Amino acid sequence: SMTARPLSELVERGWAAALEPVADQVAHMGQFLRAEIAAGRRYLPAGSNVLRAFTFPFDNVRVLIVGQDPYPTPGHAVGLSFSVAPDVRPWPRSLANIFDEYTADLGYPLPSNGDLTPWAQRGVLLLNRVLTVRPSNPASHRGKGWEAVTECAIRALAARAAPLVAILWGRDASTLKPMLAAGNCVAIESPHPSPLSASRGFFGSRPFSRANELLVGMGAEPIDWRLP
Ligand SMILES: O=C(O)c1[nH]c(=O)[nH]c(=O)c1F
Numbered sequence: 001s002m003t004a005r006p007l008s009e010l011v012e013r014g015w016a017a018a019l020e021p022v023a024d025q026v027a028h029m030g031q032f033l034r035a036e037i038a039a040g041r042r043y044l045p046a047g048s049n050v051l052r053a054f055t056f057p058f059d060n061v062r063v064l065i066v067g068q069d070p071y072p073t074p075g076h077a078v079g080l081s082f083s084v085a086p087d088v089r090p091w092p093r094s095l096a097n098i099f100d101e102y103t104a105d106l107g108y109p110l111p112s113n114g115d116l117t118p119w120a121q122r123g124v125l126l127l128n129r130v131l132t133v134r135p136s137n138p139a140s141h142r143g144k145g146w147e148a149v150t151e152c153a154i155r156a157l158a159a160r161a162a163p164l165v166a167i168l169w170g171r172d173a174s175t176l177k178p179m180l181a182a183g184n185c186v187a188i189e190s191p192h193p194s195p196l197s198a199s200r201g202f203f204g205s206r207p208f209s210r211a212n213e214l215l216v217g218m219g220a221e222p223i224d225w226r227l228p
Pocket of ligand 1: 066067068069072082083092094095128169170194
């Protein structure tokens with residue numbers, strides 16, 4: 001796990017270099033998670049999926065989606081924010097809300113399933129501000145040291161000689177707003193797609209079409225958002 005091995009082995013080459021300043025903090029998080037198991041508390045997602053968002057190429061990222069923390073229901077979280085395994089049904093409520101906005105915004109049919117890896121394969125970073133959670137306890141790992149790691153990840157993206165659009169979903173995601181001051185970066189901010197906050201302005205936010213207009217405006221290729 002991230003206790004055992006260096007970034008060079010755990011994440012993609014560009015990410016390994018981008019996250020060098022938090023190499024120790026990443027090892028520290030591995031120890032936090034080992035202490036959780038030792039005490040008999042569980043975490044999500046599975047250890048090998050915690051850093052999965054950093055296994056897609058750093059240099060290929062054009063859009064950053066940031067949520068709060070992983071799905072608290074066992075069998076949901078896969079290390080990509082809001083993504084579920086292609087065989088998961090029903091979809092978690094957040095994802096149902098995201099796909100309703102996806103159809104409203106882009107005019108596409110409902111996706112066949114909740115598997116977002118096409119977005120990750122097409123330059124969308126599916127990040128959470130905090131990369132682990134205790135089952136059934138949303139925000140249970142807030143302030144345990146992931147924030148430094150996702151802050152570093154964002155600074156590094158914003159320092160690239162490349163265009164970037166950030167979609168920040170909810171209050172924890174929005175605390176990355178200051179580290180997105182770079183001129184080649186633009187932030188879309190909305191309430192979380194979670195049922196508690198969705199009606200406060202998630203619905204009708206049109207994040208997907210706006211992201212693409214912003215990319216086009218910076219001479220970047222738009223994202224192909226269409227899922228099968
Ligand atoms: O629990 C959720 O709905 C949820 N919320 C988030 O902010 N990110 C996720 O990756 C996620 F699965």
